[model samples]
Target: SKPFTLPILTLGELTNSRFPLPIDVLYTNPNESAIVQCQNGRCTLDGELQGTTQLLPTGICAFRGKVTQQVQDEHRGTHWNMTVTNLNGTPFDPTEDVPAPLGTPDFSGQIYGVISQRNTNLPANRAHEAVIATYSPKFTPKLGNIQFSTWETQDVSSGQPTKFTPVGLASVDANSHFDQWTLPSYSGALTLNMNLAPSVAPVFPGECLLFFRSFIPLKGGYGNPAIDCLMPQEWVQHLYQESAPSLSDVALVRYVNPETGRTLFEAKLHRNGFLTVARNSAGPVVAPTNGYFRFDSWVNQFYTLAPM
Candidate 1:
């Protein structure tokens, strides 16, 4: 009733709704699943939903009818599942890919069906487990060529030190290819450059994609000198004030405080989908949010195979 976007409506719930709930009947090959739309405690496979509806309460819908063309194939049993895509052409987000209006070819639509299974209140019957899965193509967000000639200046404040280390936190999106992460499930992920070797304690479901400069400390410096981090400010501010975001605006590398082991600054894409940063220092300890930024749509979180 929350403005209907196609809810999962698991099997076994007693029928009480007045609207049609679309579902896919899973019995054989996932590709062979039949699309059926059921409503008003009834369902249909062959035209006009003449099939009598029966809720089995144990996770299956058993409906059959002689009013239609014929009977169902014995090879196919009963199960329910569904999957959808985004209308903007962006791949589905585990967070934002909720149901939109239902009725486009693949964007959103309910394809449900119920094939007969032996159920004379009897034995020798089996229920094959059915799962709902919508396939998302392997969409990798590309960091295109960057354009620059931007400039800005800042004198390291009163107590500021020359050693400025950079660190980052970019949220992993559903599109983030699983291989991209050393281990997926939101725990700790290896960065785009596998060799930075960040030493921070592992933390995830937040602060997932941590970033830092990825080179050896050439001649006379410790691993990486914090002073080298100064370059990010100009390029970051360059993109922040631009008319729109482009590949050039994407800031892959930025800074942190190696001295105190605290962030030098942080930025984030707000829950509202807009991006912002917090860099003013109220005290010597005050800092920012994310060290870098990337469009959430570009992050795909699955392996090469579909979950179905």
Candidate 2:
């Protein structure tokens, strides 16, 4: 029997398990031919969800909803994130019923939505896509303010070479309104500087979503590194290449152990959620397994607006 490819239905990825509590009744201004789908199945704007009979595009799909609500107009260049609740037997809810470092708690019940851009007038089409990454809440990663002091270093032993070249660090003018920073997603020109050593060069677009309980991962050298879901040291990420990974494309996060200086973890970024790992860098170093190191988090493989 041959495997039928019926647009291949699968579980869609979620960016947050929760959103602001006050939010309710998702709304968006989608143009003609645009569609809005969810985790359960393709939901009709009138408010009806089907199970296996219908299919939800899974992964990240376009956002579709009523545009009557004026609030949705605010999120023109970014995802028109809406808050939906599991009123009754709706089938699923994307929010986890918990509070995040920022925003309100996840709404109750099964609710999911995506607002994509089809009109050339909408700014979202010119902006980067949204992504959700996880991290060890216990570890405290450092954020640097280097003025483009980072460079690509070589792992002489592994035979990896410099792939992506450094153009310049993102400038942060004292004024907040210098360059508009889109919400739910950011311009790849993030201000922080990483990949200081030069071996690989932090994956292009070295940025991550920062949260109260989330740990931070510094971007290192690698064009687009793979992300290891369960463990931090399991990614087999490769180095960044200048000509590879066409413009506007994101690279994966490479698993690296600062203690052993070894490449340990790897996996491609998937929608819904990221491969989470616990951080417990213990005392006194050892040869393997139990060492004084911990695989914290990474800021790799992300989307950004194409440069004009």
Candidate 3:
């Protein structure tokens, strides 16, 4: 099994404006409370001039307008250069840094930060879509701390949340970038078709899985999510979702060690409510059984006997 890959969405580019980066003006236009003053080709915001350069006077009576620039924060050890238009008809170099959102109460003490939101609550097998949400860790070289990210969905009709599913690993390191800083206190929402990764066995598709990052920290006694690798012999928990329990809905089970690309377990169910477990040549040894297994369709969970 290869490492799981999740699609991340970039909220927006961080723009560096010659304009003063105000704390209250995050993700919104700053002109609302900004007061501008200009004289002799020199401009100032709230009485203080930022850079020593004078601008090309926009002609007379204190040209009052929105002053701004573009800046980009590089992640993954990458940087983007941006040019700022000065008042003196000159383009000056401007820089931007990643917004530090960790200090906020919302992100404080959280190992995994929710990057976005998805809205999808619909009927079953109706070709619904889920918006992709991303979670980025704040730790540096310690980026490898989080192993797997799990997401859970809820059924609006029943007002119940489903079991968490392992979407992917938090393998991407934000510190690996040039603008290596914690994420901004912001999140985004976008649509992704209900189609799940091939590695994820098929589930009755209708209600979109609004996935969020359920972090599994590697150290500091952090707890693993409901669905994560617990031991070498334990590849994963139940992967199949519960359905109407009719013979028409079948279940497929697979236990593969993603890190080693080894299959540790295998089982499946036929439409006739028959299930069989077969020992794979590469996985752990299994004890002889009575060829019986139990499943809970209402809860979308499965039960298995201990392997000797």
Best by lDDT: 3
Model 3 segments more than 4 A misplaced: 1-186, 189-265, 268-308
Q: In candidate 3, what are the lDDT values of residues 1-308, reduced to their tens digit?
A: 22121111111211111111111111111122212111111111112211121221111111111112222224321111111122232322222121111111111122322212222355332111111112333221011111112132321112111111212223234331211022212222132211111111213321111111112332123333221111100000011112122332334434344445444444444332222343222222232221212232211324341221
Output the worst ten-in-a-row residue range by lDDT, candidate 2.
233-242
Task: Please name the candidate that would achieve the greatest TM-score relative to the true structure.
Answer: 2
Q: Candidate 3: what lDDT?
A: 0.21
Residues 171-290 of candidate 2 have per-residue lDDT tens digits of 222321111111111101332312111111123342222110111121322222111111111111111111122221222333344466664533222222122222223221122332
The segments of candidate 2 whose C-alpha lies over 4 angstroms from its true place after superposition are 1-68, 71-81, 86-226, 231-308
Global local distance difference test of model 1: 0.19
TM-scores of the candidates in the order shown: 0.15, 0.17, 0.16
Task: Rate residue 48 of model 2 by lDDT.
Answer: 29
Model 1: residue 273 alpha-carbon error in angstroms: 5.0
* Clash count, one per candidate: 26, 42, 18
RMSD of each: 27.9, 23.3, 26.5
| Residue 287, model 1: Cα distance from true site in angstroms | 18
lDDT against the true structure, each candidate = 0.19, 0.19, 0.21
